[PDB]
Structure 1
Amino acid sequence: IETVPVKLKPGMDGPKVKQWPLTEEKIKALVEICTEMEKEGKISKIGPENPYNTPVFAIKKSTKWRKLVDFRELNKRTQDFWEVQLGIPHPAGLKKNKSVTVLDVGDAYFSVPLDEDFRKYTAFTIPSINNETPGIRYQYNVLPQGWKGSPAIFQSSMTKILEPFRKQNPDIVIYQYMDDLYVGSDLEIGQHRTKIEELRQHLLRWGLTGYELHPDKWTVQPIVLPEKDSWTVNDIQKLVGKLNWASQIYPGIKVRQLCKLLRGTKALTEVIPLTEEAELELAENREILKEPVHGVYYDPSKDLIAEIQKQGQGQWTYQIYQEPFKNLKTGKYARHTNDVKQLTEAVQKITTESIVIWGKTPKFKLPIQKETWETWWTEYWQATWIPEWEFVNTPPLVKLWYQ
């Protein structure tokens, strides 16, 4: 099979990312996996003349250990190839479907050889305990799982594999994002589940051997205003602040009447009777809050940002935007689950939604300690992709403004 030449972006070159320490069990799982891939010719041992490195981890999903290569740096360094040169158009219909099934299709890539002059950039190391031995180093001879260039090259083969199925089912949306297929329909749940089984058989004939979303049922988490009888000084202070903030993002928010009620140096606990003008503006603000943001639109040339807040008792809120308050989507996540397990689950849910909606993973702003997250994320991770992340300190007031 003839390889497609991968032309790395000018100036900068390959990734030189450190391998993070791995537990004994994960190391062993990786050595067994890699021995096999080496025998099957998928990967081959490398010399020290290869200065490149990308991290490797071991996840589950399953009782089976699976290898996960972090190609985040390689992907950034090949952006011209997979996004502009080659490029998978994202269907706007996918988010409108009653059902979206997610299919792991990454096993396809190993039947397609990688350009001989690009293999060096796919280098990774299996580390050892207490640095007994230098790490086991390998590079790929086939399209690697996790590299954005893989579905880009495999596009043509994927189109052929899918042509009959698509022709027979013209109202089924099939989208390929990295190692997965997103299959959407407006069929009855039983019929949808039947059509995906049919598609698996088509996949099965080429080699390639689910996860069920409901996008039409995806609703916003509006900024909620308290619905109460007796309003305290604190309560309205809390309201004006919540409302003063929403007025930056939402067009048409009014506060003058509510603000007007707070006159003089009063005690926080003092119950102050409401006016039937202030009651009208909160009713109008409520009405704006339940609706989408006016004037906020997706720009394909700009990165997506996701911010998460720990709300306590297994609940988490999140927002997706490109401009710091001009937010495209806001939602929530609910849970023996611990904080890292919960945050891992939430980052993955938000990411699947971003893929469905925009065809782009967001850049996360995680309210955790880098090191905690670095040691722990792999224990609960189950996706075949990894999004980008930053470590932040949730501003105290952002949390309460979102429930």
Structure 2
Amino acid sequence: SPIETVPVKLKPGMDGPKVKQWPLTEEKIKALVEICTEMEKEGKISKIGPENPYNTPVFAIKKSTKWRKLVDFRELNKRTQDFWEVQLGIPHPAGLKKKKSVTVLDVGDAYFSVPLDEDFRKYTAFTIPSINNETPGIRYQYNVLPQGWKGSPAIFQSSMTKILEPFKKQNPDIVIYQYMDDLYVGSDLEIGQHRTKIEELRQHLLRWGLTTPDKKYELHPDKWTVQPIVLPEKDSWTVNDIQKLVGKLNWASQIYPGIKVRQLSKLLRGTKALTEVIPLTEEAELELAENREILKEPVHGVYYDPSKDLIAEIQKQGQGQWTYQIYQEPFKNLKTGKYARMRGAHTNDVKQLTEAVQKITTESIVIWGKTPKFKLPIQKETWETWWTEYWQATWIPEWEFVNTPPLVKLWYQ
């Protein structure tokens, strides 16, 4: 106890989180018991009685070949951080998304030193489940700053600034942003000098008592932009190809209202066979090429509204390819991309969507400083079973599950 605990107070008129515990594998339950038993000896967590009605989910991820414990503090965050982002919030630099290389460093070990406010410890309660409802479960609560809770970096913020101050003086062109458990370090240096300066920061933090398990994940934010909608270009065109072209250009009119399709729809008068090859007129080629360059320029009036939340839609494209869009209001995409994992006998759908969500969330953290809510194309119960299998991040974004994706599949590739 270096200094008296920072008093944590929830927003007035709101009770703590009471979330259910999803059933876990016997393998995962045994891992959590070993971790929590060690955390109990080291004074981090302590068992609680029945007068603690709150609960918070706890899972087991693979960090590596050893088990790592991940807590779903999403509900406690919205019950504390929404009032704590105003009080001890961390500002987000808008220049981090402009560097050439951004490395992520896990600094979640620092919170294990700071004590947690005794009155607030009852809200960090979590339960290790039992198989077949044999025992009522093992209920712990946190005595130190817990990982995954957004209040721990806000409390440790002043401590983090002091440690990073000498490094910032030696490197005034390096951007360092902290999000919960991760230290985003971006620079414009060469790849060799970047990893050298990253190692210097690793050795700098390590010699100040801040251990970071990264003894052998870099990004490049200058390549993250709204991808342009490409129109197919074939040597010849048939009735069916022009139908898919006008239908796609009509859907694009909701985004670019300066698109005309009267000359493309006049090339086919009607009652023609689908496989009938139809050459284009000059005004059809003029209207086509005119609608190509207007589709290769970004939209007008598309800005980020901090008051509104971020929304990310993902859709399956097959052959290990996934496309996504990030917006706040419909058809106002702030950022679009396409995630692609190497196919083979080493991958499946759920693994690809999981890594895609983690890649999108990391991009949204760097660009805007907050995570989006995902509209996932997967069955709810299915995703809630296997999402921890391939999850490597230390945070958990919000998500909901959709069931009716239209013909958009072809329109976004």
TM-score of the two chains, using structure 1 as the length reference = 0.97
Query: Which range moved further: 30-39 or 268-277?
Result: 268-277
Give the percent of matched residue pairs that are identical in Structure 1 and Structure 2.
99
Q: Secondary structure at the match of 1:383?
A: coil
2 CA distance for matches of 1:85 and 1:154? 13
Do the aligned partners of 2:102 and 2:185 also contact (CA within 8 Å) in 1? yes
Q: Secondary structure at the match of 2:60?
A: strand
- Which of residues 292, 301, 314 in structure 2 aligns to 1:295? 301
Query: Which range moved further: 159-168 or 221-230?
Result: 221-230
Q: Secondary structure at the match of 1:207?
A: coil
Do the aligned partners of 1:70 and 1:386 also contact (CA within 8 Å) in 2? yes
Do the aligned partners of 2:226 and 2:334 also contact (CA within 8 Å) in 1? no
Q: Deviations along 1:15-53, whole A, 9 cap, x unmatched? A: 111000111111111111111111111111011111101
Do the aligned partners of 2:116 and 2:142 also contact (CA within 8 Å) in 1? yes
Note the C-alpha offset of 1:153. 1.1
Do the aligned partners of 1:19 and 1:56 also contact (CA within 8 Å) in 2? yes
Q: Deviations along 1:222-254, whole A, 9 cap, x unmatched? A: 211001122112211111111111111234222
Query: Which range moved further: 270-279 or 305-314?
Result: 270-279
Q: Which runs of 5+ in 2 are unaligned?
A: 211-216, 341-345
Q: Secondary structure at the match of 2:388?
A: helix
Note the C-alpha offset of 1:75. 1.0
Note the C-alpha offset of 1:78. 1.5
Note the C-alpha offset of 1:132. 2.0
Do the aligned partners of 2:225 and 2:335 also contact (CA within 8 Å) in 1? no
Do the aligned partners of 1:6 and 1:81 also contact (CA within 8 Å) in 2? no
1 CA distance for matches of 2:64 and 2:329? 39
Do the aligned partners of 2:167 and 2:201 also contact (CA within 8 Å) in 1? yes
Q: Deviations along 1:265-285, whole A, 9 cap, x unmatched? A: 222222211122222233232
Q: Please tell me whether residue 156 in structure 1 is matched to residue 162 in structure 2.
A: no
2 CA distance for matches of 1:91 and 1:284? 39
Note the C-alpha offset of 1:154. 1.1
2 CA distance for matches of 1:172 and 1:398? 41
Note the C-alpha offset of 1:219. 4.2
Q: Deviations along 1:137-185, whole A, 9 cap, x unmatched? A: 0111111100111111111011001000011101000000111000000
1 CA distance for matches of 2:253 and 2:84? 39
Q: Secondary structure at the match of 2:53?
A: coil
Note the C-alpha offset of 1:317. 0.6
Q: Which runs of 5+ in 1 are unaligned?
A: none
Q: Deviations along 1:330-379, whole A, 9 cap, x unmatched? A: 11011x20000000010011111000111111100000000110111000
Q: Cα gap change, 1:153/1:299 in structure 2, threshold over 3 Å: closer, same or farther? A: same
Q: Cα gap change, 1:153/1:281 in structure 2, threshold over 3 Å: closer, same or farther? A: farther
Note the C-alpha offset of 1:217. 2.7
Do the aligned partners of 1:81 and 1:149 also contact (CA within 8 Å) in 2? no
Q: Secondary structure at the match of 2:192?
A: helix
Do the aligned partners of 1:60 and 1:382 also contact (CA within 8 Å) in 2? yes
Do the aligned partners of 2:46 and 2:142 also contact (CA within 8 Å) in 1? yes
Do the aligned partners of 1:251 and 1:294 also contact (CA within 8 Å) in 2? no
Matches within 5 A, 1:206-355: 206-208=208-210, 211-334=217-340, 336-355=346-365
Q: Secondary structure at the match of 2:43?
A: coil
Do the aligned partners of 1:293 and 1:328 also contact (CA within 8 Å) in 2? no
- Which of residues 388, 391, 394 in structure 2 aligns to 1:378? 388
**RMSD of aligned C-alpha atoms?**
1.3
TM-score of the two chains, using structure 2 as the length reference = 0.94
Q: Cα gap change, 1:100/1:271 in structure 2, threshold over 3 Å: closer, same or farther? A: same
Note the C-alpha offset of 1:221. 2.8
2 CA distance for matches of 1:119 and 1:251? 55
Q: Cα gap change, 1:2/1:62 in structure 2, threshold over 3 Å: closer, same or farther? A: same
